Amino acid sequence: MQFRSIIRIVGLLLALFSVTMLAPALVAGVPFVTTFFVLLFCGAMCWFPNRRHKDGFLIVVLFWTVLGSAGSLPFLIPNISVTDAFFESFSALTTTGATVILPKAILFYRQFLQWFGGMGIIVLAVAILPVLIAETAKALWYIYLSLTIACAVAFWLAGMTPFDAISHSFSTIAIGGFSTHDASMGYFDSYAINLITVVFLLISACNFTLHFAAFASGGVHPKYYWKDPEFRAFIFIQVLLFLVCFLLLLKHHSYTSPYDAFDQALFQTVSISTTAGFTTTGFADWPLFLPVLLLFSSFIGGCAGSTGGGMKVIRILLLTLQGARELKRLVHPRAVYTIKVGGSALPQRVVDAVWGFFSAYALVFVVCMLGLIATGMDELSAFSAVAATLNNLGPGLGEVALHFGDVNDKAKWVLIVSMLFGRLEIFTLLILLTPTFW
Amino acid sequence: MQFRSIIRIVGLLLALFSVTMLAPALVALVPFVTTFFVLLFCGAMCWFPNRRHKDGFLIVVLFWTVLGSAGSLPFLIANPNISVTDAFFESFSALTTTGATVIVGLPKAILFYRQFLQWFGGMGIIVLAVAILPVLIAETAKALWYIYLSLTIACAVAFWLAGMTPFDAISHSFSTIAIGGFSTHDASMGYFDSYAINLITVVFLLISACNFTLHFAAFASGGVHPKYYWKDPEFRAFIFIQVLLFLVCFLLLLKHHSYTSPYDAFDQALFQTVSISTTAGFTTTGFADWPLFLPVLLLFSSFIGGCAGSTGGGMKVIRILLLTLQGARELKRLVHPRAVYTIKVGGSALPQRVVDAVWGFFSAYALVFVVCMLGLIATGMDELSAFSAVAATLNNLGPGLGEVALHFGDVNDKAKWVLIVSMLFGRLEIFTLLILLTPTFW
């Protein structure tokens, strides 16, 4: 099936991935250079005997097929077992805080991996239009420059030397919840960093596709204040979050001073809630239900045209508000229902497809919970772990045993696939399984 | 809003409910008689001053509302001496047909009435199940009577074969009419374990629980009965799921190598799997010879509950079937959105009208599920025991097996009231009280 074209294109892809492998070498390192050489060699052998050129789902799978391989070689010789080495590689990879447990070059590379993951996750994410020319690089390069320079200067304000500010900035690009120390923000708590970082968390997560027009000099920004459905819904949930935090604070009478109670409390609620992953609280001053509630909050993750693939506003919104239309259906079946919350008329093909996706998603959820518990994992610690795993924050808080090294490595391989599913569209592998497809 | 016409009909309804309140009075060795008199008095004061006569959802809510109005009065006063909230909870436990035990301990007359309550609940739930056509003449009362006579007589004679005196056979029969999971002793079959009863009862369980409205044609005399073998999908899907259940039981038996003899292992093992699975509620196993996942798996099995036209209202074959098969259509939609999908699993062409409602019902159901889990844990209940309890509660079997502490006398009584409403919600369509909360409705 035209294998000659596929070999050269795939080889070029592996070589291109390999070019971006000199990151630790800047910090005087050799295995990563070796990976570039081996894959480049692969590209070279693929490239020359075959010259001819010319499905798509196969390509997407091959895309993230690649991303998965690679990044596992320098760890078998960090002395850790091969399954654990692979698991750790994925742990560093995909911005998942999968801690079971370093060199200063490797650590820089790990934060760099977060950088690579962050840019990579949002580039083919709005490039699915042919299945459902490279000029977007510049406009993306400008927005990024604004994001990183702003973060670095913001860290600088505290007074740390630029290397430290840059180090923290690299750590927070694709937040997995990692920092210099295991405590996410407990080890260093300058007030300016906390306030500024929380602002970064709010601004950086929900929406950048909407502001793509910002590249054009039309000045369409003040229009978005009004009639933006996302803004009203999102503000209602977040403001409600603030009010409940305030109420909880008053009920327990935790901190009398405003600054610690508001910044620290707000920081914990926002950080855990926003799927950030920076957690430094054992939730003892909070009741037990707050960890459970927060975990449910963790499920709500990502925004439309955002870094994280999770349940979105429009999907839940459609179910609820469309659900309201269904409530109206319950009142009367003779009654035509057509309501358009959005400015456009909405076609009935997409809505049905979306909730169907949710139903299949539920099936996957059952598979993940049942499978992980089924493999030999404990009912509760794994239960919290699966909730956390699907979201991609970290270890399960309830009945804490954060580091699972002694769990079965084949299941660990399953954990890798599950977290990968957490980031990538889950049903790509699903298309592979079906018997009608063969 | 024409209140004079609601007063007489509702009063008549209360009096009618009261008419069948003489059940313990047959067993000498008064409060229930008092309930009949008080409600009859209520009907009387609502019948003579008003002579006039004349929405519908209010009436259905009201019918369900009537249950439990006079099901809790005789328990505050007297052998059952228990607190008022607990008395109400206990009343609902017996009445709801759920197995909500707070006590260990099972008056002969009161107990007879309790089993009788199971009889009342069993016929009552089925009768109004198909009477919802005006919103979505009483000639059915004899055709259901023949079928019911067949069911009760068959159960009694079946128990009689074992060799117990007819009173004991009838007692067990009354106990198994609507299946709470109760017997003379707390263990379902541990106290008496005769083999004929076990085999016959399992047959009873399989036949009784699915689907009897298909066999409503059994009353008019015709030959339609052989045709159903190839006629219905329900048989292929249901048989496939049950057979798979048998195979997994067989394979888990051979993996652990539990019992070498085939009589005990197949009947006891099969009995346990089917009984826990079929929303029956008869449980005598602590699941130690089974791994821990089997209790979890069984609880998931408990969620699958009811057949279309069956006594219990729980997720069904057609709903899940629609999601998966229609889901398959959805699966085929990722391949080409340009591709028209129209498929009819059933004999008729199926309309796109009802189908959105089914999954919408599931979505709303999930919302309710979140409310129940979050609310019960939120009230002050424990993490895990409550979690198993809510799964079990929605189904209406009994206690959560995992980390078992079935009896919860010391749990908060207002939440216990919430538990009562939750289990009732399991039995009746949850939404029937959801149309009250909406502000657009007022």
Residue numbers in the entry:
A (entry chain D): 1 to 28, 36 to 61, 68 to 90, 94 to 117, 123 to 153, 178 to 483
B (entry chain C): 1 to 29, 37 to 61, 68 to 91, 93 to 120, 124 to 153, 178 to 483
Which sentences from the paper describe this structure?
TrkH, KtrB, and more distantly related KdpA belong to the superfamily of K+ transporters (SKTs) that are found in bacteria, fungi, and plants. TrkH or KtrB proteins assemble with their respective cytosolic partner proteins TrkA or KtrA to form a stable complex. To better understand the mechanism by which the Trk system functions, we determined the structures of TrkH-TrkA complex from V. parahaemalyticus in the presence of ADP (TrkHA-ADP), ATP (TrkHA-ATP), or ATPγS (TrkHA-ATPγS).
The structure of TrkHA-ATP was solved by cryo-electron microscopy (cryo-EM) to an overall resolution of 3.0 Å. The TrkHA protein was frozen to the cryo-EM grids in the presence of 10 mM ATP. Interestingly, TrkH is in a partially open conformation and the dimer interface is also different from that of TrkHA-ADP. First, in the presence of ATP, the N2-N2 interface is lost, and as a result, TrkA tetramer becomes two dimers. Second, the HN1 interface is no longer present. In the presence of ATP, the N2 domain has a rotation of 36° relative to the N1 domain when compared to the structure of a TrkA protomer in the presence of ADP. In the TrkHA-ATP structure, the tetramer-to-dimer conversion in TrkA moves the N1 domain almost 13 Å away from TrkH. In contrast, TrkH in the TrkHA-ATP is in a partially open state and the ion permeation pathway expands to more than 2.1 Å in radius below the selectivity filter. It seems that opening of the ion permeation pathway comes from an expansion of pore-lining helices and the movement of the intramembrane loop towards the intracellular side. In TrkHA-ATP, the neighboring D4M1 helices form an angle of 45°, while those of TrkHA-ADP is 59°.
